[PDB]
Amino acid sequence: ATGDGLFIMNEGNFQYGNATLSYYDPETKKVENEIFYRANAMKLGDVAQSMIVRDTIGWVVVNNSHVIFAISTNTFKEVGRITGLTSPRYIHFISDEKAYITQIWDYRIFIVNPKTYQITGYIECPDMTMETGSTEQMVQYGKYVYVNCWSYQNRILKIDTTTDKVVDQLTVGIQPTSLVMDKNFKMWTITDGGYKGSPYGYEEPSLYRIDAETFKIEKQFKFQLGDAPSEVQLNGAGDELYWINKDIWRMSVDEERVPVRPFLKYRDTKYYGLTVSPKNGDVYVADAIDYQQQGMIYRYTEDGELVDEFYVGIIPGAFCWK
Amino acid sequence: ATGDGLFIMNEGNFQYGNATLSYYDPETKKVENEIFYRANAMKLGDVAQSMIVRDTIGWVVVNNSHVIFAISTNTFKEVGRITGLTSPRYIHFISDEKAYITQIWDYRIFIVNPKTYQITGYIECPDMTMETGSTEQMVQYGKYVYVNCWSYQNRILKIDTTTDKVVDQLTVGIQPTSLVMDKNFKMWTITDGGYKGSPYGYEEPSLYRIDAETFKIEKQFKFQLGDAPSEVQLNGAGDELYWINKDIWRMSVDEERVPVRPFLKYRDTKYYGLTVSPKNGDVYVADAIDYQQQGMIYRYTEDGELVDEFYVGIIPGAFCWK
Ligand code: NA
Ligand code: NA
Ligand code: NA
Ligand code: NA
Ligand SMILES: [O-]
């Protein structure tokens, strides 16, 4: 919320158990690596995946360790953990006593009580199996949570939080990757188009603007076959949209045309991850390099001036702001 | 948010300039009176009316001093103030840089930037004048702010926060007093019925349950002619509704009939304000007594057991949790 500190989730290598958590302070430009291991004398696990901060507690999703850790955002000390998660993706709080945890390889969204760390129920997604089930990012509008369904799916689902039931769905292009809501209460999702030879599909990917109140598609911007966009996101004001599509792209949330010029042109760095400071609009991009050594983060001002570079953990893939 | 500290706004006597601010610590059962004056060497003013707390800053609305003071919730020292307000009632933040302040004797809701303390615009309410205009409490559902219109009015208005315009209205009984939203995203408002000899009107007052998503009245509970109810309030979970109508009344938000038995019996005084601890469900009742002598606060458990009683300022009518 403040933008005064940045957490970086380093995925590590799948099944090698070498995920780590980094913390960067934009004011001092100092990075700290392996902070969870150093504070807890315990490895973070396998494939760190996402994180949210809520009232000085950070909730770190470790996808292939089937766990979310609650940690102090000051000391990085574990205060609790939720285990038993099929393959968790994101956590979104409904209240202090209720949160939803999305999953891959499950047709259910898990409901937890964050005060007890216990799973209290499940939301069954329609027309989904354990074999190809996928739920991902969540946004909330009024009483409803919207969630994109990514791997081998092509839908946004609408959940009534007063009943914990899916009440509607919206079909989009195959594999919407991410989901955010702007200052006009329009949701944005960008699909990745599958891939050549996919058992599911391969098509031109698209960026959609969807009214949150009415769940209606308002705009669809189509890209080229072969593009695999990802990580649509917003600045702090919710009025500038960013995403990855080889380059880093941005546009005003009121634009009716996608710009021809990107924010950061792709040349010598493959952009593995992206975030925007909610405080000053700085843009951060992750470089996974060779997927074996420390990856690095580049920090740009909103005007494109490179102001910092810092090495983190292995395959930095997600960000979370204090 | 925590429920560890309670502010009490003592209205003082109208036009006497003797409003004060009190702070109560439920753990020690210690009250501190005249805290604003003690911390700032400045009288609070005339008709302190309401307060909200946002990120350790308290925003104290002083209706007949035309000002909202931003104070530290630790030291109670002023950090800034918003002046130039016709006769402010409540403040509701839309974002860090945008808040709405309702008014009596104005047809406009003021828009402010709380970071600069400046008035940045106005929301014109339809079919309202400076002479009898009234906007009062606010709740937000999605992109919309709903507001009750109290003195010489009989409406709830719906404001689109993305345009800062009134986009809809709902007629209710005359003079809806207060507005809350429960855990089912139903709004509740209770009218006072005017009074016999009012220049505006007089009728049986009612409690309404209104769907926030569709702005539709779902339930209307009518009371006896001559009652003048006020101050709907919710517990922390948003599942028990309380209000004043001589006695203190409560019911589950899922109840289909108003109860015949009250929570706290009338005692020949003037219950004037009400709050529920969001931490433990204790119920606090502000008693203005006779509107002249020093008021008292009664603290009860959610089960009706008296826990404490303490003296505050003159006409204690509003509460805010730290
Ligand atoms: Na709505
Ligand atoms: Na590049
Ligand atoms: Na009516
Ligand atoms: Na209490
Ligand atoms: O009154």
Side-chain angles (χ1 to χ4, degrees), chain A residues 187-214:
Chain A
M187 296 186 286
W188 294 84
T189 185
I190 200 167
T191 65
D192 67 21
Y195 60 88
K196 206 184 192 141
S198 168
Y200 187 60
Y202 177 50
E203 58 178 47
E204 292 180 345
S206 292
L207 174 66
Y208 298 81
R209 189 180 81 203
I210 302 163
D211 184 53
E213 178 188 2
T214 65

mmCIF file of all heavy atoms in Angstrom, chain A residues 187-214:
data_model
loop_
_atom_site.group_PDB
_atom_site.id
_atom_site.type_symbol
_atom_site.label_atom_id
_atom_site.label_comp_id
_atom_site.label_asym_id
_atom_site.label_seq_id
_atom_site.Cartn_x
_atom_site.Cartn_y
_atom_site.Cartn_z
ATOM 1 N N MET A 187 -12.291 -4.095 -14.952
ATOM 2 C CA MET A 187 -11.335 -5.188 -14.804
ATOM 3 C C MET A 187 -10.562 -5.333 -16.105
ATOM 4 O O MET A 187 -11.105 -5.185 -17.191
ATOM 5 C CB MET A 187 -12.041 -6.509 -14.500
ATOM 6 C CG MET A 187 -12.748 -6.477 -13.187
ATOM 7 S SD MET A 187 -13.402 -8.110 -12.795
ATOM 8 C CE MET A 187 -14.814 -8.253 -13.909
ATOM 9 N N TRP A 188 -9.286 -5.728 -15.980
ATOM 10 C CA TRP A 188 -8.474 -5.984 -17.149
ATOM 11 C C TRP A 188 -7.898 -7.380 -17.020
ATOM 12 O O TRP A 188 -7.429 -7.777 -15.943
ATOM 13 C CB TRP A 188 -7.334 -4.999 -17.249
ATOM 14 C CG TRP A 188 -7.757 -3.578 -17.490
ATOM 15 C CD1 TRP A 188 -8.143 -2.653 -16.555
ATOM 16 C CD2 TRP A 188 -7.858 -2.947 -18.770
ATOM 17 N NE1 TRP A 188 -8.405 -1.442 -17.196
ATOM 18 C CE2 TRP A 188 -8.250 -1.599 -18.543
ATOM 19 C CE3 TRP A 188 -7.612 -3.386 -20.090
ATOM 20 C CZ2 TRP A 188 -8.397 -0.673 -19.579
ATOM 21 C CZ3 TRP A 188 -7.775 -2.447 -21.148
ATOM 22 C CH2 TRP A 188 -8.178 -1.114 -20.867
ATOM 23 N N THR A 189 -7.927 -8.115 -18.127
ATOM 24 C CA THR A 189 -7.248 -9.386 -18.141
ATOM 25 C C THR A 189 -6.561 -9.494 -19.487
ATOM 26 O O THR A 189 -7.029 -8.937 -20.475
ATOM 27 C CB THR A 189 -8.243 -10.553 -17.893
ATOM 28 O OG1 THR A 189 -7.490 -11.769 -17.800
ATOM 29 C CG2 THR A 189 -9.269 -10.677 -19.058
ATOM 30 N N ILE A 190 -5.448 -10.194 -19.512
ATOM 31 C CA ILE A 190 -4.733 -10.422 -20.768
ATOM 32 C C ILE A 190 -4.497 -11.914 -20.932
ATOM 33 O O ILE A 190 -4.175 -12.591 -19.960
ATOM 34 C CB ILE A 190 -3.429 -9.624 -20.798
ATOM 35 C CG1 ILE A 190 -2.952 -9.451 -22.233
ATOM 36 C CG2 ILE A 190 -2.350 -10.233 -19.884
ATOM 37 C CD1 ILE A 190 -1.857 -8.398 -22.244
ATOM 38 N N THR A 191 -4.756 -12.436 -22.121
ATOM 39 C CA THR A 191 -4.602 -13.882 -22.289
ATOM 40 C C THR A 191 -3.233 -14.180 -22.889
ATOM 41 O O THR A 191 -2.559 -13.296 -23.429
ATOM 42 C CB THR A 191 -5.668 -14.476 -23.181
ATOM 43 O OG1 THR A 191 -5.514 -13.958 -24.512
ATOM 44 C CG2 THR A 191 -7.072 -14.131 -22.671
ATOM 45 N N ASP A 192 -2.816 -15.443 -22.794
ATOM 46 C CA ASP A 192 -1.504 -15.730 -23.361
ATOM 47 C C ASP A 192 -1.586 -16.468 -24.695
ATOM 48 O O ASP A 192 -0.546 -16.662 -25.344
ATOM 49 C CB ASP A 192 -0.587 -16.455 -22.350
ATOM 50 C CG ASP A 192 -1.021 -17.878 -21.985
ATOM 51 O OD1 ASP A 192 -1.766 -18.529 -22.723
ATOM 52 O OD2 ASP A 192 -0.502 -18.381 -20.945
ATOM 53 N N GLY A 193 -2.786 -16.818 -25.147
ATOM 54 C CA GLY A 193 -2.958 -17.424 -26.458
ATOM 55 C C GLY A 193 -2.589 -18.882 -26.567
ATOM 56 O O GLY A 193 -2.602 -19.415 -27.681
ATOM 57 N N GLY A 194 -2.309 -19.551 -25.452
ATOM 58 C CA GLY A 194 -1.842 -20.930 -25.592
ATOM 59 C C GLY A 194 -0.433 -20.954 -26.169
ATOM 60 O O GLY A 194 0.390 -20.062 -25.923
ATOM 61 N N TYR A 195 -0.132 -22.006 -26.936
ATOM 62 C CA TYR A 195 1.176 -22.068 -27.588
ATOM 63 C C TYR A 195 1.111 -23.080 -28.717
ATOM 64 O O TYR A 195 0.233 -23.939 -28.738
ATOM 65 C CB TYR A 195 2.301 -22.421 -26.602
ATOM 66 C CG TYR A 195 2.129 -23.746 -25.925
ATOM 67 C CD1 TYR A 195 2.616 -24.917 -26.505
ATOM 68 C CD2 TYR A 195 1.494 -23.846 -24.694
ATOM 69 C CE1 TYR A 195 2.459 -26.128 -25.881
ATOM 70 C CE2 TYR A 195 1.332 -25.058 -24.076
ATOM 71 C CZ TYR A 195 1.819 -26.196 -24.680
ATOM 72 O OH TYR A 195 1.668 -27.408 -24.080
ATOM 73 N N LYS A 196 2.068 -22.983 -29.645
ATOM 74 C CA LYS A 196 2.040 -23.852 -30.816
ATOM 75 C C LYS A 196 2.263 -25.290 -30.380
ATOM 76 O O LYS A 196 3.243 -25.579 -29.689
ATOM 77 C CB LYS A 196 3.099 -23.433 -31.836
ATOM 78 C CG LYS A 196 2.729 -23.839 -33.279
ATOM 79 C CD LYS A 196 3.839 -23.507 -34.278
ATOM 80 C CE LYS A 196 3.340 -23.650 -35.716
ATOM 81 N NZ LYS A 196 3.883 -22.575 -36.602
ATOM 82 N N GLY A 197 1.299 -26.163 -30.701
ATOM 83 C CA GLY A 197 1.325 -27.539 -30.250
ATOM 84 C C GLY A 197 0.618 -27.798 -28.940
ATOM 85 O O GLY A 197 0.594 -28.943 -28.483
ATOM 86 N N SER A 198 0.042 -26.780 -28.315
ATOM 87 C CA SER A 198 -0.665 -26.994 -27.058
ATOM 88 C C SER A 198 -1.833 -27.962 -27.238
ATOM 89 O O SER A 198 -2.576 -27.871 -28.217
ATOM 90 C CB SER A 198 -1.184 -25.654 -26.501
ATOM 91 O OG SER A 198 -2.097 -25.889 -25.444
ATOM 92 N N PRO A 199 -2.066 -28.857 -26.276
ATOM 93 C CA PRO A 199 -3.263 -29.701 -26.334
ATOM 94 C C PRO A 199 -4.539 -28.908 -26.156
ATOM 95 O O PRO A 199 -5.624 -29.416 -26.471
ATOM 96 C CB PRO A 199 -3.058 -30.675 -25.171
ATOM 97 C CG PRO A 199 -2.255 -29.883 -24.199
ATOM 98 C CD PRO A 199 -1.323 -29.025 -25.019
ATOM 99 N N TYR A 200 -4.443 -27.660 -25.692
ATOM 100 C CA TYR A 200 -5.634 -26.874 -25.411
ATOM 101 C C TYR A 200 -5.970 -25.915 -26.543
ATOM 102 O O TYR A 200 -7.114 -25.874 -27.004
ATOM 103 C CB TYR A 200 -5.435 -26.109 -24.097
ATOM 104 C CG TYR A 200 -6.674 -25.382 -23.609
ATOM 105 C CD1 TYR A 200 -7.855 -26.069 -23.322
ATOM 106 C CD2 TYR A 200 -6.644 -24.005 -23.418
ATOM 107 C CE1 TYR A 200 -8.990 -25.393 -22.883
ATOM 108 C CE2 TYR A 200 -7.774 -23.310 -22.986
ATOM 109 C CZ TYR A 200 -8.932 -24.002 -22.711
ATOM 110 O OH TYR A 200 -10.029 -23.329 -22.278
ATOM 111 N N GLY A 201 -5.007 -25.116 -26.986
ATOM 112 C CA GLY A 201 -5.296 -24.201 -28.064
ATOM 113 C C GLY A 201 -4.118 -23.310 -28.351
ATOM 114 O O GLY A 201 -3.127 -23.267 -27.606
ATOM 115 N N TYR A 202 -4.246 -22.592 -29.458
ATOM 116 C CA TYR A 202 -3.231 -21.639 -29.902
ATOM 117 C C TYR A 202 -3.948 -20.608 -30.757
ATOM 118 O O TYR A 202 -4.554 -20.969 -31.768
ATOM 119 C CB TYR A 202 -2.144 -22.370 -30.692
ATOM 120 C CG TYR A 202 -1.052 -21.522 -31.288
ATOM 121 C CD1 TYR A 202 -0.371 -20.576 -30.524
ATOM 122 C CD2 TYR A 202 -0.634 -21.728 -32.601
ATOM 123 C CE1 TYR A 202 0.681 -19.832 -31.066
ATOM 124 C CE2 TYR A 202 0.406 -20.978 -33.149
ATOM 125 C CZ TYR A 202 1.055 -20.034 -32.372
ATOM 126 O OH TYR A 202 2.082 -19.292 -32.904
ATOM 127 N N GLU A 203 -3.873 -19.331 -30.377
ATOM 128 C CA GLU A 203 -4.650 -18.297 -31.047
ATOM 129 C C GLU A 203 -4.035 -16.968 -30.691
ATOM 130 O O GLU A 203 -3.214 -16.874 -29.768
ATOM 131 C CB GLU A 203 -6.121 -18.303 -30.617
ATOM 132 C CG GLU A 203 -6.235 -18.100 -29.094
ATOM 133 C CD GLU A 203 -7.696 -18.045 -28.607
ATOM 134 O OE1 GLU A 203 -8.497 -18.916 -29.018
ATOM 135 O OE2 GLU A 203 -7.986 -17.234 -27.698
ATOM 136 N N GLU A 204 -4.460 -15.937 -31.434
ATOM 137 C CA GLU A 204 -4.062 -14.579 -31.105
ATOM 138 C C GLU A 204 -4.518 -14.254 -29.682
ATOM 139 O O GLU A 204 -5.697 -14.475 -29.351
ATOM 140 C CB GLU A 204 -4.697 -13.615 -32.093
ATOM 141 C CG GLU A 204 -4.145 -13.753 -33.513
ATOM 142 C CD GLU A 204 -4.808 -12.759 -34.475
ATOM 143 O OE1 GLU A 204 -5.865 -12.184 -34.129
ATOM 144 O OE2 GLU A 204 -4.264 -12.537 -35.575
ATOM 145 N N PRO A 205 -3.627 -13.783 -28.817
ATOM 146 C CA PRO A 205 -4.030 -13.425 -27.459
ATOM 147 C C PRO A 205 -4.660 -12.048 -27.467
ATOM 148 O O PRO A 205 -4.490 -11.257 -28.403
ATOM 149 C CB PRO A 205 -2.719 -13.400 -26.691
ATOM 150 C CG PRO A 205 -1.653 -13.130 -27.734
ATOM 151 C CD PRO A 205 -2.186 -13.539 -29.064
ATOM 152 N N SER A 206 -5.357 -11.741 -26.370
ATOM 153 C CA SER A 206 -6.088 -10.475 -26.286
ATOM 154 C C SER A 206 -6.004 -9.863 -24.890
ATOM 155 O O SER A 206 -5.865 -10.574 -23.891
ATOM 156 C CB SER A 206 -7.575 -10.650 -26.621
ATOM 157 O OG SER A 206 -7.764 -10.971 -28.000
ATOM 158 N N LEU A 207 -6.147 -8.535 -24.867
ATOM 159 C CA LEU A 207 -6.300 -7.728 -23.660
ATOM 160 C C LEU A 207 -7.754 -7.285 -23.617
ATOM 161 O O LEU A 207 -8.248 -6.749 -24.609
ATOM 162 C CB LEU A 207 -5.381 -6.524 -23.705
ATOM 163 C CG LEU A 207 -5.534 -5.509 -22.559
ATOM 164 C CD1 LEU A 207 -5.116 -6.088 -21.196
ATOM 165 C CD2 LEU A 207 -4.647 -4.257 -22.882
ATOM 166 N N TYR A 208 -8.438 -7.526 -22.483
ATOM 167 C CA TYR A 208 -9.839 -7.135 -22.364
ATOM 168 C C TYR A 208 -10.014 -6.130 -21.244
ATOM 169 O O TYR A 208 -9.389 -6.257 -20.181
ATOM 170 C CB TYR A 208 -10.730 -8.331 -21.975
ATOM 171 C CG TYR A 208 -10.752 -9.448 -22.973
ATOM 172 C CD1 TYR A 208 -9.698 -10.397 -22.997
ATOM 173 C CD2 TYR A 208 -11.825 -9.611 -23.834
ATOM 174 C CE1 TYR A 208 -9.750 -11.444 -23.894
ATOM 175 C CE2 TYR A 208 -11.857 -10.671 -24.738
ATOM 176 C CZ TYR A 208 -10.813 -11.584 -24.744
ATOM 177 O OH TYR A 208 -10.823 -12.635 -25.672
ATOM 178 N N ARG A 209 -10.943 -5.204 -21.467
ATOM 179 C CA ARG A 209 -11.466 -4.318 -20.434
ATOM 180 C C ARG A 209 -12.890 -4.764 -20.166
ATOM 181 O O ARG A 209 -13.670 -4.880 -21.108
ATOM 182 C CB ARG A 209 -11.466 -2.865 -20.916
ATOM 183 C CG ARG A 209 -11.793 -1.865 -19.790
ATOM 184 C CD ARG A 209 -11.799 -0.391 -20.289
ATOM 185 N NE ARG A 209 -13.065 -0.058 -20.947
ATOM 186 C CZ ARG A 209 -13.250 0.913 -21.836
ATOM 187 N NH1 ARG A 209 -12.238 1.579 -22.367
ATOM 188 N NH2 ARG A 209 -14.490 1.238 -22.189
ATOM 189 N N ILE A 210 -13.221 -5.020 -18.899
ATOM 190 C CA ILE A 210 -14.504 -5.652 -18.553
ATOM 191 C C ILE A 210 -15.113 -4.832 -17.433
ATOM 192 O O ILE A 210 -14.479 -4.658 -16.388
ATOM 193 C CB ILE A 210 -14.316 -7.109 -18.085
ATOM 194 C CG1 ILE A 210 -13.619 -7.929 -19.169
ATOM 195 C CG2 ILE A 210 -15.701 -7.695 -17.653
ATOM 196 C CD1 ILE A 210 -13.056 -9.208 -18.642
ATOM 197 N N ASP A 211 -16.351 -4.347 -17.615
ATOM 198 C CA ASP A 211 -16.965 -3.571 -16.526
ATOM 199 C C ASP A 211 -17.206 -4.471 -15.306
ATOM 200 O O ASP A 211 -17.803 -5.543 -15.402
ATOM 201 C CB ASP A 211 -18.302 -2.980 -17.009
ATOM 202 C CG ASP A 211 -18.943 -2.093 -15.974
ATOM 203 O OD1 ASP A 211 -18.246 -1.176 -15.513
ATOM 204 O OD2 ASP A 211 -20.104 -2.344 -15.544
ATOM 205 N N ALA A 212 -16.736 -4.054 -14.133
ATOM 206 C CA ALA A 212 -16.893 -4.917 -12.977
ATOM 207 C C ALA A 212 -18.329 -4.927 -12.479
ATOM 208 O O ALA A 212 -18.799 -5.952 -12.008
ATOM 209 C CB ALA A 212 -16.028 -4.449 -11.800
ATOM 210 N N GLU A 213 -19.040 -3.808 -12.557
ATOM 211 C CA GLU A 213 -20.393 -3.818 -12.009
ATOM 212 C C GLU A 213 -21.293 -4.752 -12.795
ATOM 213 O O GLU A 213 -22.082 -5.504 -12.210
ATOM 214 C CB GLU A 213 -20.963 -2.412 -12.007
ATOM 215 C CG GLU A 213 -22.415 -2.440 -11.470
ATOM 216 C CD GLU A 213 -23.119 -1.104 -11.623
ATOM 217 O OE1 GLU A 213 -22.518 -0.153 -12.170
ATOM 218 O OE2 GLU A 213 -24.308 -1.023 -11.219
ATOM 219 N N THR A 214 -21.177 -4.731 -14.118
ATOM 220 C CA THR A 214 -22.086 -5.496 -14.960
ATOM 221 C C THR A 214 -21.459 -6.730 -15.570
ATOM 222 O O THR A 214 -22.177 -7.470 -16.251
ATOM 223 C CB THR A 214 -22.630 -4.611 -16.076
ATOM 224 O OG1 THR A 214 -21.538 -4.220 -16.945
ATOM 225 C CG2 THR A 214 -23.296 -3.369 -15.419
#
